[PDB]
Amino acid sequence: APAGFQLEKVVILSRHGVRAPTKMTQTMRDVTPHQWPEWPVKLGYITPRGEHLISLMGGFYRERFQQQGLLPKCPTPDAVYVWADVDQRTRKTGEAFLAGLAPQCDLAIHHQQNTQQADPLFHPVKAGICSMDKSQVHAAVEKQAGTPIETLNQRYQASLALMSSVLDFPKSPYCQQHLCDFSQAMPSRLAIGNKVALEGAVGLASTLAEIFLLEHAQGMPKVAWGNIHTEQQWNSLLKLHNAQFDLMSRTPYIAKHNGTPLLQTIAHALGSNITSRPLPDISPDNKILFIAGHDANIANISGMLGMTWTLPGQPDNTPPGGALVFERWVDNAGKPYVSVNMVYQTLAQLHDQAPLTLQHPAGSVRLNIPGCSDQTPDGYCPLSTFSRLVSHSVEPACQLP
Ligand SMILES: [K+]
């Protein structure tokens, strides 16, 4: 931080930790002759190991926030607040974060009281806050791709060939029941206007690549049937996943519909004069706000703010436990600024369960907000400017009533 700057508040939008596959469909089973390995928990649940890996991040956050003078060297209950999505995986990630940040302090997490409905903070379109127009979705995704979607597979030939090899797709029951080239067999298509999906090879491979990454992060004895040997290969496979998220979650039209409530909540917590839905029982003296969500949430916020990144040592742009960390800093004369970093465990740190300390830290990338005309060279954006960007980026129809 520049000369005289002081950290005042932190807002962490974190993905949940290492989880089992959220689904295992007949198609997923049929695209390989290999057997998918069994997980120790129900579909979509965070594992005990994933909780531990989140706690290690909590421990890192504690050391960092102590160092920067924000936290004491148990915090007061007012100083730390957790809002988790209703899923087991997010709830337990919020708990695991507190177990690392403030061990055995019994700090509360919060979440929506009806866990049988979507939380509109995280899924406003699904919750029925607002809707999208089918023709505008189609147009926006095509523009984001810069190529017709029908030929998207051509752009990812190398990656799709590598997926095919890892799966042994030509030998699979799918190829037995239907040339059997992964890319040609499953052309990319957009399925749409409150439900939007990328169908075909890239969509499917995106899911599978993420599952392989989760297997590795879980320290499973056999990952992708032993077929992923190098970091290059991990990058090539996760490229498919990152691409699907660029199109389905970063595309500004979609990003603004699904991301508006979160961005308002984040902005308000940083000190913007943006309406946001108050979080129940939060203190005006709050110092750390931890929001436990999903990769789509991070990607939405990325899209809205025009923020892009690559993470050294981490093939997934939105890995389990990876978090956008927004910070309000003030200069010596009390002017507020916002910084944003994408803070994460490398693939190796996930696999090894590495302790994360000041000496051996989490990965961290400082993000540029391109529209922040008066940002400093080290990426500090005046709050006044940040607030204007937020005002321009939100979809008013999607603000939380
Ligand atoms: K294991």
Numbering used by the authors: 4 to 76, 79 to 183, 188 to 201, 205 to 413
What text comes from the article?
Phytases (myo-inositol hexakisphosphate phosphohydrolases) catalyse the hydrolysis of phytate into inorganic phosphate (Pi) and lower phosphorylated myo-inositols. Here we report the identification of two HAPPs from the enterobacteria Hafnia alvei (HaPhy) and Yersinia kristensenii (YkPhy), together with biochemical studies of their pH and temperature optima, as well as their phytate degradation pattern, which show that they are 6-phytases. The enzymes share a common catalytic site architecture located at the interface of the two domains involving the conserved N-terminal active site motif RHGXRXP and the C-terminal HD. The two-step reaction involves a nucleophilic attack on the phosphorous by the histidine from the RHGXRXP motif to form a covalent phosphohistidine intermediate while the aspartic acid of the HD motif serves as a proton donor to the oxygen atom of the scissile phosphomonoester bond.
The MIHS-HaPhy complex is the first structure of a 6-phytase showing a phytate analogue with the 6-position in the catalytic site. Co-crystals with the wild-type HaPhy grew in clusters of insufficient quality for data collection, but a successful hit was obtained for the 5% active T308A mutant of the enzyme. While the mutant MIHS-HaPhy complex crystallised in a different space group to the apo-enzyme and tar-HaPhy complex, the overall fold is essentially unchanged, with one molecule in the asymmetric unit and residues 184–189 disordered. MIHS is coordinated by Arg18, His19, Arg22, Thr25, Lys26, His128, Thr219, His306, Asp307 and a number of water molecules. The Nε2 atom of the catalytic nucleophile, His19, lies 3.2 Å from S6 of the MIHS and is in-line with the S-O bond from the inositol ring. The OD1 atom of Asp307, the proton donor, forms an H-bond with the oxygen at position 6 of the inositol ring, Fig. 5b,c,d. Thr308 has been mutated to alanine in the MIHS-HaPhy complex, so a potential H-bond to the 1-sulphate is missing: Thr305, the equivalent residue in EcPhy, coordinates the axial 2-phosphate. There is a second MIHS bound between three symmetry-related phytase molecules in the crystal, in a completely different conformation, with the 2-sulphate in the equatorial orientation and all five others axial. A key feature is the presence of a potassium ion, coordinated by four oxygens from three sulphates of the MIHS (1, 3 and 5) with its ligand shell completed by the main chain oxygens of Gly230 and Gly231.
